[PDB]
């Protein structure tokens, strides 16, 4: 989910938010639980567990 910006910043793809510094994107790993919201996309991609 870590993506680099064009001005020397980071941007979260899964959280769909901006990160001011390198520590901001590194603190949206334990937080910004967009990984738990991917269960709907995983169930839509595969109907079985």
């Amino acid at each position: 989910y870590f993506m680099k910006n064009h001005l020397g910043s980071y941007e979260c793809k899964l959280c769909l938010t901006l990160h001011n510094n390198e520590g901001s994107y590194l603190a949206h790993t334990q937080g910004k639980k967009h990984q738990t919201n991917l269960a709907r996309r995983a169930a839509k991609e595969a109907k079985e567990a």
């Binding site: 510094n21 390198e22 520590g23 901001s24 590194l26 603190a27």
Partner: protein
């Protein structure tokens, strides 16, 4: 400086766990906020895994009270002997023991 935010503290703990302990220049090139000496001081003060940040008891208070009179200065010498080893919790405990016993 040195505000020591939580997102910087987690990055410093990850850099200490990944890179190493005796490499302070390698850990300071991934934070963009502090120098290598400040990162080593933070790792030895608050980010150390052996630091007892809680559980202040009466045995440690009696050990620190029976040590501040034998040596009035040099609180850094009594940091690892008392068992706190944070170099600032000893002065804070001494200030708390001096303020609570004054009333």
């Amino acid at each position: 400086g040195g505000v020591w935010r939580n997102t910087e503290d987690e990055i410093l703990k990850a850099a200490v766990m990944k890179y190493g302990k005796n490499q302070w220049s390698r850990i300071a090139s991934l934070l963009h906020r502090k120098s290598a000496k400040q990162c080593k001081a933070r790792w030895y003060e608050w980010l150390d895994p052996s630091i007892k940040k809680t559980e202040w008891s009466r045995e440690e208070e009696e050990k620190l009270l029976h040590l501040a009179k034998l040596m009035p200065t040099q609180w850094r010498t009594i940091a690892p002997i008392i068992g706190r080893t944070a170099a600032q919790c000893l002065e804070h405990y001494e200030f708390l023991l001096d303020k609570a016993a004054q009333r």
